[PDB]
């Protein structure tokens, strides 16, 4: 409705201004156990969901959608959005995942929870890929909003119309940096294929979160449980 009229720079500026803040973990760390490390991560994820919900409402075109469609898109994409943000702020910390400014973890600390080292290595590899590609912040907010609109669209012409505009915004950024036509569509393809792996990491993370609720050891919030229940 209104998103389609923005220019490429107006879209970048709108997405940058909508960025949620980098939240902090619960201090006084004490190494971590399986129950304590998972409590810190799920406590952090629940607080970030509240900011993500308000960030989504500031994505141009997202408010033009039905409440049911906004619910569906967030229910499907919330874990991918948490992951691409974690990967993004972990770029300048190779070998470590910056969950929070006071919670920087490496692959060794991921062994406190069984099966987490696989997710950890997958998240670390994505961060190294972005760092190798020299991913820019303007490109990051485009990819993150693409995840929000695309991850649930297959389960609608307005959503695809906004996706095309964010695509034009991606090309506009690469043409700004001096990339040739061949380098533009190649970099566009490389960035979008990484979203397939981010989808894969989310699906693996959902199974752990489900087996985590079925453990009842580490508490999960009602909001975090509702987002889980939508994938069952």
């Amino acid at each position: 409705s209104l998103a389609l009229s923005l220019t490429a720079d107006q879209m970048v500026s709108a997405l940058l201004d909508a960025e949620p803040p980098i939240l902090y973990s619960e201090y006084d760390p004490t190494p971590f156990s399986e129950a304590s490390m998972m409590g810190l991560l799920t406590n952090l994820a629940d607080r970030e969901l509240v900011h993500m919900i308000n960030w989504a409402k500031r994505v141009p075109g997202f408010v033009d959608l039905t409440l049911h469609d906004q619910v569906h898109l967030l229910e499907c994409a919330w874990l991918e959005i948490l992951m691409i943000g974690l990967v993004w702020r972990s770029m300048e910390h190779p070998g470590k995942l910056l969950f929070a400014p006071n919670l920087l973890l490496d692959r060794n600390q991921g062994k406190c929870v069984e099966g987490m080292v696989e997710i950890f290595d997958m998240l670390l590899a994505t961060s190294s890929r972005f760092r190798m590609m020299n991913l820019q912040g303007e490109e990051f907010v485009c990819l993150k909003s693409i995840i929000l609109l695309n991850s649930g669209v297959y389960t609608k012409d307005h959503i695809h119309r906004v996706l095309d505009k964010i695509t034009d915004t991606l090309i506009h950024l690469m043409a700004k940096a001096g990339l040739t036509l061949q380098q533009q569509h190649q970099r566009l393809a490389q960035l979008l294929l990484i979203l397939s792996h981010i989808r894969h990491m989310s699906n693996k993370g959902m199974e752990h979160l489900y087996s985590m609720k079925c453990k009842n050891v580490v508490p999960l919030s009602d909001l975090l449980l509702e987002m889980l229940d939508a994938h069952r």
């Binding site: 509240v50 919900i53 308000n54 989504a56 409402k57 409440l67 906004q70 619910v71 967030l74 229910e75 009602d222 909001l223 509702e226 987002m227």
Partner: peptide, 9 residues
């Protein structure tokens, strides 16, 4: 659901 409330607030 809680997601409904936060999307409207």
């Amino acid at each position: 659901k809680i997601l409904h409330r936060l999307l409207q607030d």
